[PDB]
Design a protein around this ligand. Structure first.
Ligand SMILES: NC(=O)c1ccc[n+]([C@@H]2O[C@H](COP(=O)([O-])OP(=O)(O)OC[C@H]3O[C@@H](n4cnc5c(N)ncnc54)[C@H](O)[C@@H]3O)[C@@H](O)[C@H]2O)c1
Ligand SMILES: NC(=O)c1ccc[n+]([C@@H]2O[C@H](COP(=O)([O-])OP(=O)(O)OC[C@H]3O[C@@H](n4cnc5c(N)ncnc54)[C@H](O)[C@@H]3O)[C@@H](O)[C@H]2O)c1
Ligand SMILES: NC(=O)c1ccc[n+]([C@@H]2O[C@H](COP(=O)([O-])OP(=O)(O)OC[C@H]3O[C@@H](n4cnc5c(N)ncnc54)[C@H](O)[C@@H]3O)[C@@H](O)[C@H]2O)c1
Ligand SMILES: NC(=O)c1ccc[n+]([C@@H]2O[C@H](COP(=O)([O-])OP(=O)(O)OC[C@H]3O[C@@H](n4cnc5c(N)ncnc54)[C@H](O)[C@@H]3O)[C@@H](O)[C@H]2O)c1
Lengths: 253, 253, 253, 253
């Protein structure tokens, strides 16, 4: 089913979701390339992953870093079959509050970054007769989420980017889809005081926050050939956060 | 790698989409109950599946039936863990041309039908501590498709009914999502003029209609625990059809 | 500035959003034909509305009344230029707690009833050289709302069905759009527990339920020639109910 | 009808949609502050609009410029009651074809430009007790349109920026909606061979391209109190371009 024999570059794979996806894909047969700004950790992720993994330094906003890392894959593995655009920075504040400078920063990573990744990897995949680009968006890209400011703007952008890219590359067998994670447990969200566990996140239909491995599974599905006719699609992995409001809220929560 | 060891019932499982979902389910371990109105074929398909498959006549618009085949799976197999609502019919005419007689018929099978399946298996799956209901909607449920009238109206109804159900059953570990396949090659479509293969369906970004086995892959995945944090979702398997207009169309020509 | 000088039929016209529209639609100078099953109230309403109004009986489920009423509007006013599909019933219970007979009766009125209206009115408006059909869907037809069961199903139904009719009738200059009202104060919802007034409904961005006049104004925008290039569109009037979750919910309501 | 006895600022006011909105707003009784980079044409227009029009130079990507113009608007007309974020630039090329510096250029204006717009203008609106921000998006922000690249990513970003702002500014009585015009008759499109007139646009359900005033009419609606309950909505003025493919395309023609 969801098996591999390909080379997938994972951006933001030094930690959290990115590493998890790497771990899962390597565990599925793919040879991965981790790319992050977090070097020390990254190589540590690679080193633990095994021989199917290499770590590469990559600043998602620098076209040259992309060009170099994409090239490193073709050389070091023979091809580039998958791209998982995960690297990004978040926002937790009201619109008027956010500085235009920071707005611009966040939008650079989250949006313009996946674009540089796309246009850059596209030729390598054309070279390989098709490929899969999985754009990790957010639940903030599926509905208006209070307090996401620049992050909301950029996750909506990634959703349209995937879609229009999907219609342009279909004939080249280049698949492009977006995955949308809801509240996930990570030491970082743990720092927000987010508790993992059934009953611990009542404001999402499933009453709980998700796990990194849960989102990682859907990334692999879209990397595998079991989804050979899926493109310009959006997959929400949020325990129903974006589907509709919690019952309690429909009454008075 | 989406696995199984549970019992799932596949409505509309005689021929086409249903049968292949049944097929793929079995190859992953699931115990399947092909329910259908088409008794001869459906019985043969179960025959071709093996011991992992039971057939059951079921006219989806009959509450009594659903209660019977669910009961049967319960007794026959010890549980109900998956329900793939695929048994529908189709509308191939303009709205002003259609008779309220056919409209009622299409809606009744395509919409009310899945409602009953859902209302019936819910306790079955509460007893099992969770489940997965995959309502097979269509591209007609994701946009306005000319010539689908009742089939389309009912497919939007089915997309929506999947969502409100997901918010109510989240806490019960029951997961409702919708699969929306595009143009599939079927001897009927073949007859209706549909050619299978590359460049054989230019009016979809990917340039071809999908093989029935390409949809089935997506159904099996949402049935699996690989997607445990996935509810109130809508997956489209249509080679870009529903994402946006084809380049040529964007240009006119 | 929205103005009308044409004939328009409003279903569910005896009261609520329906009658409010009739008032405003006459204020804009249209000739309205109210239609309802509540004939006592209905005639009374048309009386208060004056001479630009005519009450006709219409059991939205009986294709005959549609014909009788559509024949009348044309003969009494020479043309049928608008149709506001407002008649409908509600649902407030957990899905698996709704009988299939009720499920069916609600769909019949909310879904098929708008269909019979579209088909019947089409030729009439074609003879008039165009027209405007406004289907009063719901905020329940824009996301998965809990406890709406049948009402949800049909509302998603009414939304998708407007889109195909829009694509089909676009060249006949017959415009079709759907209006989606969120929580609104109507004496019926009063007999629900709903309150009109500031902060009285904290679970929608704006803080309170809307008034009937807020909805009618929109229906009239789309019923007018100001929205001449508008078809296949969905206008939510719900104080952001549908737009995304409330700031409080977003933080741990 | 829609009356606007208030003061609203229009970006990209020198020409096109911006201008046609200015005329209709001033006609609705609004006091207008046109803003743009094209000082030459901008001045002329304001003049031709009357003593209810003022032209302010404003480069949409510069905060000082915004800070300046909104201030001037407060002094001059005593308040800021509306904002139509219309300034922007387009794109006509394949993603893999467009440069990073260009992508940036375009995002900055269409997305970042609207952010600084909203941020700056919010305090003025709280001051007044409410307001209406109309973010002019595009059909490109509602689906995957090929060749829009940076324009498409930014118009999708604008769609979600508006929705999040609306959840956060609900109780402040500041409404935020997105207008999404499709193909429009404009000498720009005209140089492209786009002919105005019925039948002249096959690939849109309505069989033709729209006029600026058709879109200008929706702006005045959202800006007016007539839409006091609309927030976080999206309105497509596009002849059904976004609601499913054209019948011909459905029939594989
Ligand atoms: N719970 C969540 O954290 C959550 C919620 C919703 C959506 N998501 C999406 O899932 C993705 C992964 O979530 P996460 O918690 O693992 O995030 P994370 O922040 O823990 O990890 C993402 C990685 O991106 C890296 N990165 C940042 N800037 C970079 C740059 N410019 N170049 C290269 N790499 C860079 C970071 O250094 C980090 O290690 C996120 O990007 C987010 O958009 C996450
Ligand atoms: N245009 C299309 O055909 C199309 C496109 C996309 C998705 N789909 C989806 O798949 C289904 C149609 O299935 P298909 O295309 O594989 O072929 P199909 O139309 O042959 O349907 C599959 C089965 O449903 C059965 N069925 C009909 N009425 C039934 C009833 N009342 N009770 C039980 N079973 C019944 C049929 O006999 C058949 O065995 C629909 O549910 C639809 O959502 C269809
Ligand atoms: N009020 C809200 O908050 C709200 C929200 C979303 C959607 N809606 C929808 O708006 C429409 C009605 O709004 P309302 O507030 O005026 O409600 P209402 O029910 O108070 O009044 C509308 C009318 O529907 C009529 N009706 C029912 N069956 C009929 C039939 N068979 N033939 C003819 N008329 C029939 C009733 O007689 C009634 O006069 C319905 O579709 C409702 O579902 C209302
Ligand atoms: N063919 C079209 O013109 C067309 C069609 C559909 C949608 N749209 C969209 O609708 C809006 C207006 O369309 P239009 O028909 O008026 O097109 P237009 O390009 O003639 O007008 C856009 C205006 O933005 C101004 N502008 C650019 N950068 C600016 C900045 N930095 N600060 C201030 N002003 C700036 C331009 O100089 C121009 O006057 C745009 O956002 C556009 O994306 C345009």
């Amino acid at each position: 089913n969801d098996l591999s024999g390909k080379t997938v570059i994972i951006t933001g794979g030094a930690r959290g979701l990115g590493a998890e996806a790497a771990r899962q894909a390597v565990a599925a047969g793919a040879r991965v390339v981790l790319a992050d700004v977090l070097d020390e950790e990254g190589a540590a992720t690679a080193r633990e992953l095994g021989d199917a993994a290499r770590y590469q330094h990559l600043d998602v906003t620098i076209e040259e870093d992309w060009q170099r890392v994409v090239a490193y894959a073709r050389e070091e593995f023979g091809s580039v079959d998958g791209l998982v655009n995960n690297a990004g920075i978040s926002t937790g504040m009201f619109l008027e509050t956010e500085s235009v400078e920071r707005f611009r920063k966040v939008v650079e990573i989250n949006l313009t970054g996946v674009f540089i990744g796309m246009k850059t990897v596209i030729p390598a995949m054309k070279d390989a007769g098709g490929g899969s680009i999985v754009n990790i968006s957010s639940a903030a890209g599926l509905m208006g989420l209070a307090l996401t400011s620049s992050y909301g703007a950029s996750k909506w952008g990634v959703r349209g980017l995937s879609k229009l890219a999907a219609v342009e590359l279909g004939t080249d067998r280049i698949r492009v889809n977006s995955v949308h994670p809801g509240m996930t447990y990570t030491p970082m969200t743990a720092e927000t005081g987010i508790r993992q566990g059934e009953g611990n996140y009542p404001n999402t239909p499933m009453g709980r926050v998700g796990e990194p491995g849960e989102i990682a599974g859907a990334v692999v599905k879209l990397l595998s050939d079991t989804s050979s006719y899926v493109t310009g699609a959006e997959l929400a992995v949020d325990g129903g956060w974006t589907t509709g409001p919690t019952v309690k809220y429909v009454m008075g929560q």
